[PDB]
Amino acid sequence: MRECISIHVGQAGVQIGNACWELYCLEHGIQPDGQMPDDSFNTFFSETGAGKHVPRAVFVDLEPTVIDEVRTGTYRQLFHPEQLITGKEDAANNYARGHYTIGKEIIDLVLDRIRKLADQCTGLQGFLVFHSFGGGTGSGFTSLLMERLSVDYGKKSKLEFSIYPAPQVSTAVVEPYNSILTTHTTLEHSDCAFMVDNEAIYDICRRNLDIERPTYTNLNRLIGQIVSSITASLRFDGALNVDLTEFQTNLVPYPRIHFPLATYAPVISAEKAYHEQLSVAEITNACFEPANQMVKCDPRHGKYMACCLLYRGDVVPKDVNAAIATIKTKRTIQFVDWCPTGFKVGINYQPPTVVPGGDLAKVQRAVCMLSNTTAIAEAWARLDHKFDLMYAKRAFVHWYVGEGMEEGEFSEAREDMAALEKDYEEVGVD
Amino acid sequence: RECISIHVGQAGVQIGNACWELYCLEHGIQPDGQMPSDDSFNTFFSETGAGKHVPRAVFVDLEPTVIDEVRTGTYRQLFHPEQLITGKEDAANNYARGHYTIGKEIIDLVLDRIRKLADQCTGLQGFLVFHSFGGGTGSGFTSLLMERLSVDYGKKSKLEFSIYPAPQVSTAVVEPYNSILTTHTTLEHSDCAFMVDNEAIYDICRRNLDIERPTYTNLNRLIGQIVSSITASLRFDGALNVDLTEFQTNLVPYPRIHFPLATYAPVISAEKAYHEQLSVAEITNACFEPANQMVKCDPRHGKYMACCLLYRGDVVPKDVNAAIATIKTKRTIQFVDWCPTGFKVGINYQPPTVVPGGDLAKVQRAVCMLSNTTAIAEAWARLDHKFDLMYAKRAFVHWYVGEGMEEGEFSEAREDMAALEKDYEEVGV
Amino acid sequence: IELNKATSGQSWEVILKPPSFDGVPEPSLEEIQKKLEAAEERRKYQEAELLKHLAEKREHEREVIQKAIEENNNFIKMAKEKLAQKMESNKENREAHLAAMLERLQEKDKHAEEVRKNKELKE
Amino acid sequence: EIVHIQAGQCGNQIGAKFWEVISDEHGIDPTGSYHGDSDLQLERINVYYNEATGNKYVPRAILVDLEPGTMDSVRSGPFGQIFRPDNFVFGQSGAGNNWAKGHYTEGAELVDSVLDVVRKESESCDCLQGFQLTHSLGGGTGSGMGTLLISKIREEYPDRIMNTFSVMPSPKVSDTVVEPYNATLSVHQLVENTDETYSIDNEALYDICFRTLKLTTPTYGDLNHLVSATMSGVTTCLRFPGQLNADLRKLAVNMVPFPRLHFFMPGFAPLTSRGSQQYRALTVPELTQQMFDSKNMMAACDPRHGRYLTVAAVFRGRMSMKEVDEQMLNVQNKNSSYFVEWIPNNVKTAVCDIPPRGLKMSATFIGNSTAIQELFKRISEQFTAMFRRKAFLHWYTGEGMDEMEFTEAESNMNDLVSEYQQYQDATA
Amino acid sequence: REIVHIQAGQCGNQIGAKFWEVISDEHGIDPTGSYHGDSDLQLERINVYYNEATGNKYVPRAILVDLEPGTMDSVRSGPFGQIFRPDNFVFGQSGAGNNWAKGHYTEGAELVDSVLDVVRKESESCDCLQGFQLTHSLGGGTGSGMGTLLISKIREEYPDRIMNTFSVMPSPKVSDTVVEPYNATLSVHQLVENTDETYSIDNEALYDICFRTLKLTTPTYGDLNHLVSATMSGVTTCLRFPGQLNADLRKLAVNMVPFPRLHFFMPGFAPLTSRGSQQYRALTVPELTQQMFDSKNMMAACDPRHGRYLTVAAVFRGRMSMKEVDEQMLNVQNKNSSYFVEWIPNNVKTAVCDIPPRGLKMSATFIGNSTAIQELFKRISEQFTAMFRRKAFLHWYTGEGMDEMEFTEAESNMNDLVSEYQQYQDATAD
Ligand SMILES: CC[C@H](C)[C@@H]([C@@H](CC(=O)N1CCC[C@H]1[C@H](OC)[C@@H](C)C(=O)N[C@@H](Cc1ccccc1)C(=O)O)OC)N(C)C(=O)[C@@H](NC(=O)C(C)(C)N)C(C)C
Ligand SMILES: Nc1nc2c(ncn2[C@@H]2O[C@H](COP(=O)(O)OP(=O)(O)OP(=O)(O)O)[C@@H](O)[C@H]2O)c(=O)[nH]1
Ligand SMILES: Nc1nc2c(ncn2[C@@H]2O[C@H](COP(=O)(O)OP(=O)(O)OP(=O)(O)O)[C@@H](O)[C@H]2O)c(=O)[nH]1
Ligand SMILES: COc1cc2c(c(OC)c1OC)-c1ccc(OC)c(=O)cc1[C@@H](NC(C)=O)CC2
Ligand SMILES: Nc1nc2c(ncn2[C@@H]2O[C@H](COP(=O)(O)OP(=O)(O)O)[C@@H](O)[C@H]2O)c(=O)[nH]1
Ligand SMILES: Nc1nc2c(ncn2[C@@H]2O[C@H](COP(=O)(O)OP(=O)(O)O)[C@@H](O)[C@H]2O)c(=O)[nH]1
């Protein structure tokens, strides 16, 4: 019951999945074979006759090398060969290819493994799409699948984990195109999209993990902490609280306005020792540091329409409310004259499980705060400007149009964002 | 000669438990019916092949519990299974439910037991109805019963024994609503009605019996004891009030003004220092003070039109008229122009019986007092205003109209209750 | 004065002041059977109207759960009917490019044959 | 006879709390069997419990939830074994704080299944009084599906009395934003589908724990404990024999003066903390003035703001009626302005010389004051915030609902708000 | 996944032979074609340029084409000349005689279908062919003419694949064949139409490097061909060696070419060395970053300071501090922002290889789309229009069947690209 099919789409999407899935295997003491010594974790894992717990996941890519690293990897056994799908030729950092030209050749087969996983779901909740914002596969294919699944599975919950691009963390000149391109095609098909700004994950590895030049693993591991911290509520059933989708009800005031901002705390390196540990009243205040946000933005300037705190480990209501009390005094946390000044809390029993031989140290109490602030719209305009810059001179566009795209798809997609920009504008009016 | 006693819903039913308790005391009937060693006691008891004297009574309640407390009681061997009538659910403090709803359901069946009771009769005088007033059952069905008994047993008497409501006892907010609707429906169907104010019984159990918080049984202990005094003239061989039609004549002069006030002396308790027992000279001055009255309405400022001084036991007529002359000496007791100033006195020689294992003290000499006073309208005036208050702002009405009634029936009843309040002005001049 | 005498009783009227005013003054089964039969109509009608109004709401649900079913099946129409156009419009556009560029080439493959011809001409 | 349906997260918890509270007073041991000191308990025990011939006493309780979470809690719970395994009607698609999901779609899938249970459960009853429902007005199962059966049952048994125990949503307690949307929609149905409704407020409940019991971190267990007390406290006139001799319809007849104005303001005396600290007996005057003061009402309104139409007061525990009666007539002489003059002797006292569990006295209250329109103003305003900008509405409209339903349900409540006003200003 | 190399004429086969000499040692392959190296990163991506054979031997995926058996024989009867499959040597006996018409139209056309027989065989045995690599002389006849004929004829048969060339622009400094600007311009007209990307190896820059920098008085072809190959191993380093990316011709094309006609790259390797000279002291990252962006280091005789970079891709080799690399690359761009287009957000992309080249502890390749490449084209038109004015040497072309107007058709197609390159140079965001 309460099933959850997770879908990993190319490079960013796949690699992040491996940090996610390794963690879950630790969170519920699962070995890289599938076996292990509260059965609420079976919403993500499927127990077999041998007792092996196989993830309710699909690893999809237009080129083989990325998925090959899983087939040869430590957890090669952990999945079915069928549930690790790979094309021969990638999308060449081009949406038009991922969506049409190349993606078309796989899409049908891809949805079959999704349907052959949908059967063993006694009572499914919905999907968890993990992708890149600027990849050919990450963007193109994702919107084609998001489009197809919304036919195939109608109005079921589709929850994206989209990796916003940052120049420091690779990138490619065309990315703002692939960014705006997918956002548009997926907007209707998304239920709730968890944006991840690659710079903010970089900026944290720099500041708190102290890493001068972060490896993808260094970030993916940090990201997977935030993601498990979101899906904690589902893999566990804690009397304390833990209650997702219910957060989603407060988070999403309007259908389009579905982008929550994450603010994980505490990010501490395996080099402190003396500092240990941190009170709930410290970590509750940490959530309001722009330095800790998943997406770089200023909600000290912008209005609020939601605030949800996802506590774990050693959290006891008394102080949570004392912590909650002190902030409700501070006049930065400003809401709309239609949206209540409430803070949806949810405490987990399980402590933040850390990656053995990692960068971050074991904490007592971990928090993540989902919030629907108009300051998220900054991410859009930030990307929309870069888009407009090359698009004016129609730079790189030819590669898109050469694959079958109309010159108008680019104009339509931008207007939709401009509408979404105006939609975050309008909502933040009293 | 005979008399069928009908008990409708809780109040009269419970009160009629105490009646046929006292009758089986004054007559020496066992709670099984068989009695060992004037014949007039049989006006209320129909003997069977087993020699058992089954009461000529019919107990009705729209809900079980109450009649089932008899089917449990010592006196369960007294009555037949047929005479105790119990429906599925009560009218729920509603007149309109009792009347049109659950009333229709139980009517025929109730009259059938009445038929079968009256089939075994050599000259059935009438009926002695026992009911509440503001009760769901003791208003809805009672008025419906009078309605069909008057048709089915026409030109045959009805002696209404009603319990007027009081806030001092277990009272319901809708009570004045049921009380008026019933009075207006029972109006033309009743031949004589004995109104009994529950507040008057209340303080009588407090000031004299010394029970501040009296049980329904304690209050009933008196009610039945004053009731037995009205019926002593019937069950025994006394000269005064021998027939049902005597009250209707002796007391009821104007047909509509058929509500005689009741008075009783002595009001006595057993748990108190023993002394010289009361004499005829004492009890006459006791009967003329409202501290013993059954309905709380000042007669000293209310025109009379009838009087009967019904003595019981060790009483002698010289001392009766030795006290009568002395009361007209001090008190001038106002009587209407059309009526002769005087009382039809009567002594039933049989002794006043008290309850064994009860509050009441055994008195050799006792006296009831049936008196028609225009001052009884000071009890209707009370109820009419409470009814006038509620209906004015139309509170609770929807419960009655939901039962099948019309809004008319409410106004209809009060328009006529006003007519009656004026008939007390038209007479009390 | 005297009224009557008996076994376990006696009665006697006692006058005090006679009246100054000589003289004194100055139910059907069918109609109950009709008035009762009438009350039950009234009770059985407003309870029948209740039944009607409740059966009306019973259709509101039958209508509401339908909107939800129709809303979704039209959503899946709207989405499938988008892909159908988009994939075809693209298949059209893309193949129409590849073929236009093979003609540019086809023609610039002809230019060659007529030069190999203009060389032979000269000879 | 009473059939007790318990709907949702709240309704099942609240209901189970009363279903152990009463069993203590009725000697029904956690496994189901009589053990009590006297047979004054067993006298009126067919009211709530049934026999497994014999004896094993089974409650006439029906358990309903669109999710199995709350059901497994009761199942595991201290008095869980006492319930009939074929009386737990639960889904898997957990309504998820959506009136529309519980009321329509999801709950409507399970409705018919639950009605089969009530049909069957009504068969064992010689002559049923009516039904009793415990539910929350902010969520999905309780708020939505609850109102659904309420309509369904009104159709299956039109003459049977509809009794509910409704916890009202508060901005203080529970962070679900939608709540005024579920509440408004469910009030709408309760206004037309119930004979009587007990308005219990979490705002008022949190504040009794906090301001009064001094409870610095009020848990549900503390909140639910005050309710369970008022539940058995109002059902003393049913469960316990005496001079009353009363029923669900008699109560409603004498209480509800106008149909729609059937929303009740429950009260209590003494306000005892969960567990702590017992002892220190209460005097008669102490027991009356407490009970009749706003700081002792489970509904968040000021009675000194409205005007009492009708009043109920079950005093439990060993006392003397002369003491009790004297203090009630003392109150109506003082607060003459706040009691309707055109409803004569409108304040009814009930006694019982049996104290509840632990404490040796009690004084449950049920006012029918026009002040309650302040409870409705609260909700209607909270609604109008989101609604004028139509926020979180998509969650509802996505279930097949139209904007018009919200328009109407709110409008229908404003009509009740205004209707309560008509009598607050009424003079004979 | 796979690449098919081809070489045309004298220069083509000379610069192509050297590329195969460099990349064989860079992969641990001996003149016999057998692998004998240590690291297994030398084999990680070997499939790209090499065909796997029997006896665990590797054979380059290359076709050897010329209308003269000259260079053809010197190569075959030379060093690594044994390594190539003798069947792929598509060598005629005509001799285009530095005539574009002779190779593209007349004598060359006779051969072309024989060449195509071989390209089809090499494309067939490919798990995934990505595209073709052409090394050719732009002033010649077989190189310039037949080589572009072969392009058009391949582009026909495989439109879906990348067409990358290493075109060597002639200089009056290196060659005194007067007709070169005719054959030069004629070939430019063809490249602008049928190649994905083109590396402009300008013989003028090549000479000045050997003359003015390397101080070689009489530079031999050997001294120039060395600079060519050094750049070629450089530009191909990421296509050949594993690491950060992934690493596709199409992924480069898409990111490096914003406008389709403008795909002529200005290569420019640092550190510049004399053919077969032992390196004393190596350079630091600043010395590398600095020298690599110098006009004195460009392989095309253009001043990047006279233009604006649309795109840049800088490839560093050997073991060095990336933070130092990132410190230096961001110094360069952020100090000289005026040379980079504002309307192409993040136009400079840096890749690093830990495997340095032979005898170099550290190297650094440059690939840029500087509009300054107009200077190379400008030159060529001035050389052509000087001769075409007096209609000089024309009978060499006409007598091959060639039309008079075909020249003016190419002259102005060439004249358009210059205005087109200028257009985007002057273009601003504002
Ligand atoms: C600046 C122009 C040339 C680059 C250069 C060179 C030609 C060359 O390299 N040539 C002319 C064919 C042979 C080749 C050279 O002999 C020196 C052999 C060893 C070589 O480099 N072999 C290559 C292979 C090769 C490559 C291409 C062509 C033939 C051979 C190798 O093994 O690496 O020297 C003759 N020079 C100064 C010249 O050709 C002459 N000057 C001129 O070019 C003028 C007069 C400006 N037109 C004379 C001053 C000699
Ligand atoms: N956070 C994070 N970002 C990544 C990761 N891998 C790639 N990216 C981002 O992904 C974007 C490029 O898209 P990709 O997902 O790598 O490309 P793709 O088209 O989906 O995959 P392929 O074509 O198969 O190579 C850039 O913005 C990168 O910063 C990763 O492991 N973590
Ligand atoms: N004196 C006296 N009055 C009684 C008795 N029982 C009830 N009453 C009065 O009857 C009135 C209410 O009417 P009830 O007859 O009890 O009610 P009911 O609806 O007819 O009876 P149910 O069938 O039990 O519902 C109140 O004024 C009560 O005080 C009794 O035993 N003695
Ligand atoms: C089943 O429980 C009850 C039922 C009723 C009453 C009541 O309060 C004492 C109950 O306890 C809560 C009741 C209520 C209100 C009245 O007036 C406001 C009234 O007149 C009268 C009453 C009740 N009558 C008496 C004599 O108390 C009858 C109905
Ligand atoms: N008093 C009380 N309120 C509760 C309880 N659980 C939830 N609530 C309230 O119930 C409302 C939400 O409805 P809920 O019962 O949770 O949802 P449902 O399961 O879909 O019926 C909110 O106003 C909460 O404050 C409980 O056990 N007791
Ligand atoms: N860089 C370089 N240029 C050369 C070489 N051989 C010839 N050239 C140039 O090639 C051009 C002439 O083309 P060529 O290769 O001889 O003609 P083809 O035999 O018809 O292809 C001139 O611009 C020469 O400078 C060489 O090995 N290297």
Ligand SMILES: [Mg+2]
């Ligand atoms: Mg890609």
Ligand SMILES: [Mg+2]
């Ligand atoms: Mg009744």
